[PDB]
Symmetry: C2
Subunit: 272 residues, 2 copies
Amino acid sequence: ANLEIGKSILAAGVLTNYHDVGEGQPVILIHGSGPGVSAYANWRLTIPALSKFYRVIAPDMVGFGFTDRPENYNYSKDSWVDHIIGIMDALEIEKAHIVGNAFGGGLAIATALRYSERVDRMVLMGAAGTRFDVTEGLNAVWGYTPSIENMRNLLDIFAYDRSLVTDELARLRYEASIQPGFQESFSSMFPEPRQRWIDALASSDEDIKTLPNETLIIHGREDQVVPLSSSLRLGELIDRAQLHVFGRCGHWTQIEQTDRFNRLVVEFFNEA
Amino acid sequence: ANLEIGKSILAAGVLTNYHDVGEGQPVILIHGSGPGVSAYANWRLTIPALSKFYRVIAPDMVGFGFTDRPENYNYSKDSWVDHIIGIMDALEIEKAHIVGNAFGGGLAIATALRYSERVDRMVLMGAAGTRFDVTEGLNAVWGYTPSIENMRNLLDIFAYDRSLVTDELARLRYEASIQPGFQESFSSMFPEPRQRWIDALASSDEDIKTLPNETLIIHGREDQVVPLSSSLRLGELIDRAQLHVFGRCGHWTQIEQTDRFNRLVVEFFNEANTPK
């Protein structure tokens, strides 16, 4: 809410809220797509680890954080990728590493396919970008409805160690879900039948086998939203890829496994 | 030869050739089971990264390196686990992290099951321990016959990037396989019908599900000897485990992805460090 709000810049036509920390090689973080989500809520623990050696760019995708929600915006993969390229052009960033969490991972893969010249290394965490049967969990996430109780439960789905889902955490995230116009745009994106959306965010197997990017796929064994089976698949499709699965870990690999995650990612990028 | 030959000690009643470098928390490196294999040959590129923070123990399992090959020894999973334990008792090592390579990962799992109080953290690299249909590769390896050509192909099977398999290496490991008594004992361990050995070396799904050890499972996607599918099973069975898979990499993960491999393994054992 407070620190979830960073800088403002006109990207690809929309006023975008984002974070720009660190200097050097650019690294873009794309948050997932849950109610109340934001660049900062998804990456406040990761950013510090990377800004010690990189310039971390963590924006709020069109209609998600505190980024404007255009009066008649048509949300789609292409739109979101146009937004990502918008932000990169506004900041005059030619090539950058991309870290995508689920919804963000799908976008990352989509972006690496359509704008190869702007993407270097990729980090896909419980990423989207490949078809998989909608899970009860994902359905819960996209089907969210404002309510401290619904949020808490929702958060339970993401974590493996429910112990991390504290009342305070539940309240705070809930508050964000009911920010001015947040639920509005959110409940308008992945309505009732959902398999469609996952398929719309995915990239064909053929295409993906094209990706020449050095890639790190991270997934929690017990991920309840995005099935492990989905990353194992990307581990097959992508050529220059590494696959790392955490045990006793939910979807938010970067939270439940902050240390291991930041260590793997930072080292992964240091290779370049 | 030469460098592969190190210290000598009596463990479980058998002269064992082994390497002991570094100091502090102990880590035991258990080699694979290819012809000519030795602890040093398998870990010479891993020892340097480890020796800076741990006491590295790299022994030659009975009948594999320059360790004595008894005149009637009955090579079996239990007999080997007992050798490991023997090695540990000899060096007066109570508990230790273990890194197993295939055949070694199998022995590592067995050890952690039979001597839970002697094993801390594990690193199973393209490890055995679960059943899996024998592969043309594992077959080509256990069915090896002395010959520079034969070795070159054996190595091509182990590697993703054949550019690593140079004539020199093939010639050196060939000479390693034809050391007095080496081939004689190798060829008498995994005869024609081999599915047996994989099964005997493995551990029940039940038992594996029991292991409480923090575990790091590593494997090469293009592994031609032990199928990636095996590690995935281990990743399902072992509770406190991580699974790391390298793309564009053969069986010897520690050789084709050295730096990547050494970092995960050193960093992994570091997580078990408590202050003062």
